[PDB]
Amino acid sequence: MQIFVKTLTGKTITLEVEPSDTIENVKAKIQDKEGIPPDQQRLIFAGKQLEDGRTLSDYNIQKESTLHLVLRL
């Protein structure tokens, strides 16, 4: 399935994931596409920040969902 991620430089990238994919996996695909260290990424789904442990299924992130990416140093 596909999820969307708004990197707040305005644009919105489109990813290809599975409900089983962990948050790290999503960060990995983001790193591939945008060149950002996973330990600098924080994924936001509807106001809540996702933990690096759980999966997309555990968050009820279904097809054509949109997450927000913020930086952390």
């Binding site: 596909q2 969307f4 919105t12 509807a46 279904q62 054509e64 969902s65 949109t66």
Partner: protein
């Protein structure tokens, strides 16, 4: 306004059964019925049904001509590959 009303009545049916908003936004973008901002506004919606709701809101606002096209878009997208359905689901 038989088309705006047609989208106002069966609004729940559409939100329920539409499973790809991307190929809808794209086609609307390519026909100048949707601004680049309208696309980003729809993409901003957290869940998929929310995106379906947002698209329907924008369509029913821009007029009747835009609505009539949206009906035609859904028709020729569902009918396009429908007879491949038995074989496709047969595999994976």
């Amino acid at each position: 306004h038989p088309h705006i009303q047609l989208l106002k009545s069966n609004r729940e049916l559409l939100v329920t059964h539409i499973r790809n908003t991307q190929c809808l936004v794209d086609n609307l973008l390519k026909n100048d019925y949707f601004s680049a901002e309208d696309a980003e506004i729809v993409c901003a919606c957290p869940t998929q049904p929310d995106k379906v709701r947002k698209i329907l809101d924008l369509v029913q606002s821009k007029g009747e001509e835009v609505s009539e096209f949206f009906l035609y878009l859904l028709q020729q997208l569902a009918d396009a590959y429908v007879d491949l359905r038995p074989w496709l689901l047969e595999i994976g």
